């Protein structure tokens, strides 16, 4: 992807204020609850199966935070988005066999998270930059599907 000067501002200025532990856990919990088939990938986490089970699981909070930090690395590198997710691509594709379409589902849900959390400061322009990024990252995990 090619990024504008004014695009990096909206993205970087907003990352600056995000609580990764809070959102990390929102993002992941919502995914598990809105798309219940994503559940089978996380069986090692003990009980899922009910909204409240999902919410009160310590793994969901810890994993969630890791996922978001990952998006961190994208904010940082903006030009180098491949190469930075290469090893992570092998893992999601080669070992786990997560169909790429779920990477989109996690991107969209992330925008709802940042949307609810930032209120009016999630302007339309900003939401457009954020989509461009969430799509760039999702594309950069697809990679190992050749």
């Amino acid at each position: 992807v090619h990024w504008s000067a004014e695009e990096k501002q909206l993205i970087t200025g907003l990352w600056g204020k995000v609580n990764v532990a809070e959102c990390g856990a929102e993002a992941l919990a919502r995914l598990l609850i809105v798309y219940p088939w994503t559940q089978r990938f996380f069986t090692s986490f003990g009980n899922l199966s009910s909204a409240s089970a999902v919410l009160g699981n310590p793994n969901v909070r810890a994993h969630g935070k890791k996922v978001l930090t990952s998006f961190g690395e994208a904010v940082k590198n903006l030009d180098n988005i491949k190469n930075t997710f290469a090893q992570l691509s092998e893992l999601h594709c080669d070992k786990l066999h997560v169909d790429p379409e779920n990477f989109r589902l996690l991107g969209d849900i992330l925008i709802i998270v940042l949307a609810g959390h930032f209120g009016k400061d999630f302007t339309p322009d900003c939401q457009a930059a954020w989509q461009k990024l969430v799509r760039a990252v999702a594309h950069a995990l697809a990679r190992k599907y050749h």
């Binding site: 609850i33 969209d108 609810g116 209120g119 339309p124 322009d125 939401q127």
Partner: protein
């Protein structure tokens, strides 16, 4: 196909976002046109610039259908039956497009009402929105 628990849950959020429907309808399309520029192919007769009163006038009727479909959540397909021709028969709308608007629609409720959109509501609303997008794309199946 919409359980009793999703229903008394979608009837609930629409009586809380009731008298704001319309404004959320304006902002919904506006976000769509900015974040998904492709969607403007369909509205070439409109003024699409940020601010337009056509866009305001249009969003007031998109809310319309939504509010309505919620009033008749047991029979959503008779409720919306004239709108399914417009979108599928006449205007021939790519179905991917119903996801995009709905997605934009959630962004707006989360902005103005962070606490109506709990994880669970998010779930009920998300299946209500693309049971609405299935009535509107029905004649392709």
């Amino acid at each position: 196909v919409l359980s009793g628990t999703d229903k008394t849950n979608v009837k609930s959020i629409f009586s809380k976002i009731g008298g704001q429907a319309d404004d959320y309808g304006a902002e919904a399309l506006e976000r769509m046109f900015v974040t998904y520029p492709q969607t403007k192919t369909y509205f070439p007769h409109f003024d699409v610039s940020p601010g337009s009163a056509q866009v305001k006038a249009h969003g007031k009727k998109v809310a319309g259908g939504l509010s309505e479909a919620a009033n008749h959540i047991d029979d959503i397909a008779t409720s919306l039956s004239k709108l399914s021709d417009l979108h599928a028969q006449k205007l021939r709308v790519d179905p991917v497009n119903f996801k995009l608007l709905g997605q934009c629609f959630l962004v707006v409720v989360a902005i103005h009402n962070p606490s109506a959109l709990t994880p669970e509501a998010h779930a009920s609303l998300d299946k209500f929105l693309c049971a609405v997008g299935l009535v509107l794309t029905a004649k392709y199946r």
